[PDB]
């Protein structure tokens, strides 16, 4: 079962939350909610009106969802541990 | 789960996410 692992805030964007499963849940300050996970090619985007829409690997997305993904890639920098690995 | 094996795999799963979205953004540049 996927537990919440780390929660991060981004001014003036929103909050992102990493889950155990490898998922990332962003809750934007415009009422939008992007959900993304490693291994899974699909992306679920919920809009301010409340509609949730799943999008597959080869589905043309509108700029409003591409912009939030660009942004999600930049939020992914805030959960990265830069400490070097040894042993 | 183990402390080393959990924390390494979570940062490994995060790296794969960044790359997946990076392919996706490029894939979109080719579409439709
Ligand atoms: Cl969140």
Residue numbers in the entry:
A (entry chain A): 884 to 970
B (entry chain B): 720 to 751
Relevant lines from the article:
PLK4, the master regulator of centriole duplication, is the most distant member of the family. It is distinguished from all other PLKs by the presence of a third C-terminally located Polo-box, PB3, in addition to the two central and closely linked Polo-boxes PB1 and PB2. Here, we demonstrate that monomeric PB3 of human PLK4 adopts a canonical Polo-box-fold and directly interacts with nanomolar affinity with the central STIL-CC region, STIL-CC. Most importantly, we determined the solution structure of the human PLK4-PB3 and a crystal structure of the PLK4-PB3/STIL-CC complex and use structure-based mutagenesis of STIL to demonstrate an essential role of STIL-CC for PLK4 binding and the regulation of centriole biogenesis in vivo.
In contrast, plate-like crystals of the PLK4-PB3/STIL-CC complex diffracting to 2.6 Å resolution were obtained using seeding. The structure was solved by molecular replacement, and refined to Rwork/free of 0.22/0.25, respectively with one monomeric PLK4-PB3/STIL-CC per asymmetric unit. The NMR structure of PLK4-PB3 in solution and the crystal structure of its STIL-CC complex display a conserved overall fold comprising a six-stranded antiparallel β-sheet (β1–β6) and a C-terminal α-helix (α1), which packs against the β-sheet and contacts residues from all six strands. PLK4-PB3 and STIL-CC interact along the entire STIL-helix and form a substantial interface of 934 Å2 buried surface area. Two regions on PLK4-PB3 contribute to the predominantly hydrophobic binding interface: First, the surface of the PLK4-PB3 β-sheet around residues V907, L917, V919, I926 and Y928, and second the α1 helix (I948, L952, L955 and L959) and the linker (L944) leading into it. Key interacting residues on STIL-CC are leucine and isoleucine residues (L733, L736, I740, L743, L744) pointing towards the hydrophobic surface of PLK4-PB3. Additional interactions are provided by backbone–backbone hydrogen bonds between PB3G922-STILQ739 and PB3K943-STILM750, respectively. PLK4-PB3 reveals a novel binding mode by interacting with the helical STIL-CC region in a leucine-zipper-style via the α1 helix with further hydrophobic contacts to the central β-sheet. Overall, the structural data reveal two core differences in PLK4-PB3 induced by STIL-CC binding: first, strand β1 is N-terminally extended by three residues to the range 888–893, resulting in a shortening of the unstructured N-terminal region in the STIL-CC complex. Second, helix α1 slightly changes its orientation and is stabilized by STIL-CC binding.
